[PDB]
Amino acid sequence: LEPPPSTFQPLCHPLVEEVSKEVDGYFLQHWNFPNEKARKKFVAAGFSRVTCLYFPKALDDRIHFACRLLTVLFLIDDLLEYMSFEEGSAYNEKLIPISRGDVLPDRSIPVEYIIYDLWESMRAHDREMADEILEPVFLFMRAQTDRTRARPMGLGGYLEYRERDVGKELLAALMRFSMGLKLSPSELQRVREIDANCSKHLSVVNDIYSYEKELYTSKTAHSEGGILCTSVQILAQEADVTAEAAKRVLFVMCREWELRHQLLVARLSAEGLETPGLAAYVEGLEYQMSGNELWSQTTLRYSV
Amino acid sequence: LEPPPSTFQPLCHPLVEEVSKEVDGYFLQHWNFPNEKARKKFVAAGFSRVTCLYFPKALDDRIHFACRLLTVLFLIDDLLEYMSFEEGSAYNEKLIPISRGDVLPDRSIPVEYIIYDLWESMRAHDREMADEILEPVFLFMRAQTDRTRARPMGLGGYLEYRERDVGKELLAALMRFSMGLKLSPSELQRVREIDANCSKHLSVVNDIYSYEKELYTSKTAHSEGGILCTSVQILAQEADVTAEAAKRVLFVMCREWELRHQLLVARLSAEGLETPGLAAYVEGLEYQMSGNELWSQTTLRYSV
Ligand SMILES: C=C(C)[C@H]1CC[C@@]2(C)CCC[NH+]=C2C1
Ligand SMILES: C=C(C)[C@H]1CC[C@@]2(C)CCC[NH+]=C2C1
Ligand SMILES: [Mg+2]
Ligand SMILES: [Mg+2]
Ligand SMILES: [Mg+2]
Ligand SMILES: [Mg+2]
Ligand SMILES: [Mg+2]
Ligand SMILES: [Mg+2]
């Protein structure tokens, strides 16, 4: 699959090597893997590497928080594929009061105390910004087991749903936390169209590279949890082409979304609405798009 | 607008110029054009040229029949844009028993006697092959004023409707008539998938090039008859991109349909199911797709 030309230059956080070893090492000690093969596959995924590609301008003392969060969510994301929608919902809902810190974790259950200790440490570093990630994460978690996954969706309906299932808002709040980048409610409101456009890029780029993984999952995992829910399958179905043909077409659309990102950013500046914070923000969103693509093209999670 | 590479090479019927003058001349003599500007625009469209590009291997004494049919359908196609769905339906339904030869035409009304004389002349030349064009034409006519045009559609839903509105079936029966290519019901059943694939190509290629014409029509003509119903609008709405962005993506999809055409034809041959008639037929479909693109690229109908 040859990617069409992009003007975006992907950037990686300079501390990616040490943070990856730190965070991978943490999960290897605490997380319950089924076997040595799974432990190797975990490291092979490079979960801290995505994070460092998503937020390359995160503060040096905050990047590890982001790596820990995306890592545990990735691990949960895989676990949910072997559960029903009901079981998956129960699993996630239990982690929500724990994430808030309102309920103590069962220290014998790794996922419970990993989540608790993480959010506690994040609030310890920056309480105000850590709290602003809470609701976006919960929105993402509840989307993962949404019944709409078991209903037919057009491309438009899917992308609207997938903004939550891909965790667009959490990525936004996580990015701001990691950068210590604060925005007023007025600034946040102004870039909503830019956010929605970015979400489609992230979602479809992931759909493109994770298709083989998710096709296999749909044939082997739970009938509900492993369900095939992706723009690749939808376009292939609607246009009556192969999945690989759908990928090539979708990749072209992703480049159009990149063009639209630049247009919207230019218009924000052409109008009076550009601020230093917003400039850093929309630039950060570009890194998410290019970083997500670079990681997707190289991670063993999708190629194996 | 840069067309992505294609391996389909267009062919034109050798007698295109002489038949154009004959068919253009007939309509200029009989059809009720409002003024000289409309008569010039009519000639500028090249309705016989597209027909000769659609069926370049039509028999020398049958190509004019195809040119007449497509020309009169094109003329009605524009007429319908100033009518409501109701008026458009009543207009078309009147012509249907006339086309069958069951109802005599009003000789003071050009469209009625032109359509009557056409079908009578076609039945005289080849009774059986002419009759097999009737219902496909009627299916197309009724799709033109279908109220599904004014209702929400996804890409898949549009394409399945478009197959009727683009007259894929009538074109196939017209091609067979023009070439004297007779196929058994079983043979035709073998290439159903190939027909469906070809329909999408013809539809979207037309949508891409005729968008500006149809955008203008939607803003100037009847809100119903001139309604903007096209893949360019649908995809742009689904993916939240501009029409120009949608065009570029759709053009890539068109090339995927070309690849699929070659795949399906290759499979048909390998299974020992490609009869000499079927070989001529599927080649004929390729001429339709390539011929449609060449004409769309150059006709003044879409450029002015
Ligand atoms: C952890 C997840 C599965 C969510 C957050 C990260 C992100 C965007 C990385 C790419 C794959 N999907 C997701 C969703
Ligand atoms: C006459 C028509 C409007 C129908 C038949 C010819 C064909 C495919 C040529 C291209 C434009 N539209 C059509 C539809
Ligand atoms: Mg997943
Ligand atoms: Mg998921
Ligand atoms: Mg995926
Ligand atoms: Mg038209
Ligand atoms: Mg039409
Ligand atoms: Mg058109």
Side-chain angles (χ1 to χ4, degrees):
Chain A
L1 182 71
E2 186 67 67
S6 173
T7 61
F8 289 173
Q9 171 63 254
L11 252 37
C12 186
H13 193 284
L15 293 180
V16 55
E17 292 306 315
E18 290 319 300
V19 176
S20 294
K21 174 54 62 184
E22 169 192 349
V23 176
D24 284 344
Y26 175 88
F27 280 87
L28 285 177
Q29 169 182 177
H30 299 275
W31 190 261
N32 238 95
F33 295 95
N35 50 26
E36 190 68 21
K37 183 168 188 176
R39 293 175 61 89
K40 295 180 182 179
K41 191 171 178 59
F42 167 78
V43 174
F47 289 133
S48 290
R49 184 175 131 88
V50 215
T51 310
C52 288
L53 281 166
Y54 258 76
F55 322 115
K57 292 189 177 180
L59 296 177
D60 286 7
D61 64 348
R62 285 158 97 118
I63 184 57
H64 83 91
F65 291 119
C67 293
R68 295 173 186 269
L69 182 59
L70 295 193
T71 295
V72 68
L73 291 186
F74 258 117
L75 289 172
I76 296 171
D77 181 75
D78 293 340
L79 286 182
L80 294 171
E81 291 177 330
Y82 293 102
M83 306 182 192
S84 65
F85 294 140
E86 184 176 324
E87 293 172 346
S89 182
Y91 186 95
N92 273 343
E93 287 295 335
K94 185 155 225 305
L95 301 179
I96 295 183
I98 298 185
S99 299
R100 287 196 175 99
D102 296 334
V103 172
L104 286 179
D106 188 332
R107 282 279 160 185
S108 65
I109 310 173
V111 66
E112 289 198 8
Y113 78 79
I114 287 173
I115 287 289
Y116 180 82
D117 295 351
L118 214 206
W119 285 102
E120 283 289 298
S121 69
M122 295 176 65
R123 283 186 292 271
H125 191 93
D126 192 333
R127 208 276 147 100
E128 176 183 330
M129 304 201 71
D131 282 349
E132 288 171 337
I133 316 178
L134 286 178
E135 296 297 335
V137 164
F138 303 154
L139 185 64
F140 155 81
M141 293 174 67
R142 291 173 172 137
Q144 295 180 291
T145 60
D146 196 332
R147 268 320 197 112
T148 188
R149 296 180 69 84
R151 256 102 55 78
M153 287 182 305
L155 187 57
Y158 166 82
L159 292 174
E160 200 276 337
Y161 158 74
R162 235 263 118 140
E163 183 169 343
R164 296 180 290 277
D165 182 68
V166 85
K168 175 63 185 58
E169 284 190 39
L170 89 80
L171 293 171
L174 223 201
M175 179 180 67
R176 286 180 271 121
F177 169 88
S178 80
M179 297 176 63
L181 177 61
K182 298 193 180 184
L183 301 171
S184 63
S186 177
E187 284 171 311
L188 293 164
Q189 181 272 334
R190 269 176 267 172
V191 296
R192 237 134 65 177
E193 204 177 1
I194 299 179
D195 281 330
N197 182 79
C198 175
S199 175
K200 298 180 174 58
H201 190 283
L202 297 171
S203 302
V204 177
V205 165
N206 172 265
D207 292 350
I208 285 172
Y209 286 94
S210 63
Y211 177 79
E212 268 69 47
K213 178 178 76 70
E214 298 170 353
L215 214 212
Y216 174 79
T217 286
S218 67
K219 294 177 181 172
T220 56
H222 197 275
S223 70
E224 294 188 342
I227 197 172
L228 194 60
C229 191
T230 162
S231 61
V232 173
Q233 179 58 31
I234 294 180
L235 182 58
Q237 186 174 351
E238 295 214 70
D240 210 349
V241 298
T242 65
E244 207 63 31
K247 291 183 189 177
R248 292 186 285 265
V249 174
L250 285 170
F251 225 148
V252 170
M253 177 63 70
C254 288
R255 300 302 186 233
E256 296 297 336
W257 282 324
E258 296 188 8
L259 254 44
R260 182 162 192 256
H261 172 83
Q262 295 171 331
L263 176 75
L264 293 178
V265 168
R267 193 176 80 201
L268 181 84
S269 274
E271 300 165 358
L273 312 182
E274 173 87 324
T275 65
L278 244 29
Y281 181 80
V282 297
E283 177 183 81
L285 289 186
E286 179 193 316
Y287 298 149
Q288 297 193 20
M289 284 180 281
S290 61
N292 178 66
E293 177 176 346
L294 214 220
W295 177 77
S296 298
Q297 292 167 344
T298 55
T299 182
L300 294 177
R301 174 180 172 87
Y302 299 154
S303 64
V304 176
Chain B
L1 180 57
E2 262 285 84
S6 169
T7 64
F8 288 179
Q9 295 291 329
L11 183 63
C12 186
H13 194 286
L15 306 182
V16 54
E17 173 66 14
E18 118 185 5
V19 171
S20 289
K21 293 289 183 280
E22 173 194 347
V23 179
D24 279 4
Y26 175 87
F27 286 87
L28 284 173
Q29 178 183 333
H30 294 282
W31 184 263
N32 180 29
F33 291 103
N35 46 60
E36 184 58 38
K37 182 173 180 295
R39 303 178 98 91
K40 283 198 176 72
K41 195 204 219 314
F42 168 74
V43 176
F47 292 133
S48 282
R49 182 166 89 100
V50 61
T51 301
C52 289
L53 282 169
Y54 259 72
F55 321 116
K57 293 191 177 181
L59 298 177
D60 282 9
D61 64 336
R62 281 156 104 113
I63 181 61
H64 83 93
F65 291 121
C67 293
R68 292 171 190 267
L69 184 57
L70 258 40
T71 294
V72 75
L73 292 187
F74 261 113
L75 287 170
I76 297 176
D77 184 77
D78 294 336
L79 247 46
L80 294 175
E81 295 179 328
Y82 303 98
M83 306 185 192
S84 63
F85 293 138
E86 194 76 69
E87 293 170 345
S89 180
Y91 186 92
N92 271 339
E93 289 296 331
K94 212 180 323 220
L95 305 170
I96 294 183
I98 295 180
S99 298
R100 291 192 178 104
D102 295 339
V103 171
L104 263 41
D106 191 328
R107 289 267 159 195
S108 69
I109 307 181
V111 63
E112 295 196 4
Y113 79 77
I114 287 170
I115 280 181
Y116 181 82
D117 294 345
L118 213 208
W119 286 101
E120 284 285 297
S121 71
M122 295 176 63
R123 277 188 290 270
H125 193 93
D126 198 329
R127 179 86 159 85
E128 177 182 327
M129 301 206 74
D131 283 338
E132 300 181 1
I133 314 180
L134 286 172
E135 294 295 329
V137 167
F138 301 156
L139 185 68
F140 152 82
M141 287 178 167
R142 280 154 178 161
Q144 290 183 295
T145 61
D146 196 329
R147 293 190 175 274
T148 186
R149 273 176 95 84
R151 298 197 298 260
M153 290 186 313
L155 179 58
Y158 167 77
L159 294 175
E160 106 87 24
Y161 159 76
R162 230 306 176 195
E163 181 178 329
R164 297 184 286 275
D165 185 65
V166 84
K168 171 63 184 65
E169 281 196 42
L170 83 86
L171 292 173
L174 220 211
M175 181 181 65
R176 284 190 279 116
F177 174 90
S178 73
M179 297 172 57
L181 182 60
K182 289 183 173 179
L183 300 181
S184 69
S186 180
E187 279 180 304
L188 289 166
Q189 285 162 352
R190 292 178 171 180
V191 291
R192 181 183 292 180
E193 248 189 335
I194 297 179
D195 278 331
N197 182 78
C198 176
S199 174
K200 296 175 173 58
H201 190 285
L202 297 173
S203 301
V204 179
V205 165
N206 172 266
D207 291 347
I208 290 176
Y209 287 95
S210 70
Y211 177 75
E212 291 298 325
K213 173 181 78 72
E214 293 169 1
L215 213 218
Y216 180 77
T217 293
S218 66
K219 286 170 157 52
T220 56
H222 196 287
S223 61
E224 290 190 341
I227 197 174
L228 189 61
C229 190
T230 165
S231 62
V232 175
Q233 192 280 328
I234 299 303
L235 181 56
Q237 180 178 6
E238 288 276 282
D240 256 279
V241 297
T242 64
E244 285 302 308
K247 288 185 190 177
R248 294 190 284 266
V249 177
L250 285 167
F251 226 147
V252 177
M253 173 63 68
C254 286
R255 300 305 186 229
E256 295 299 332
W257 284 324
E258 296 189 4
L259 257 21
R260 174 157 170 81
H261 172 85
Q262 294 172 329
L263 194 280
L264 294 177
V265 168
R267 259 175 28 183
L268 180 76
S269 188
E271 294 166 3
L273 301 179
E274 187 179 23
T275 65
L278 241 42
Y281 180 82
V282 299
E283 175 182 80
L285 292 185
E286 187 193 312
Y287 291 148
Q288 295 190 22
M289 286 181 287
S290 64
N292 182 64
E293 178 167 347
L294 218 203
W295 177 78
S296 297
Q297 278 165 353
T298 54
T299 182
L300 268 17
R301 176 175 172 87
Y302 302 154
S303 65
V304 24

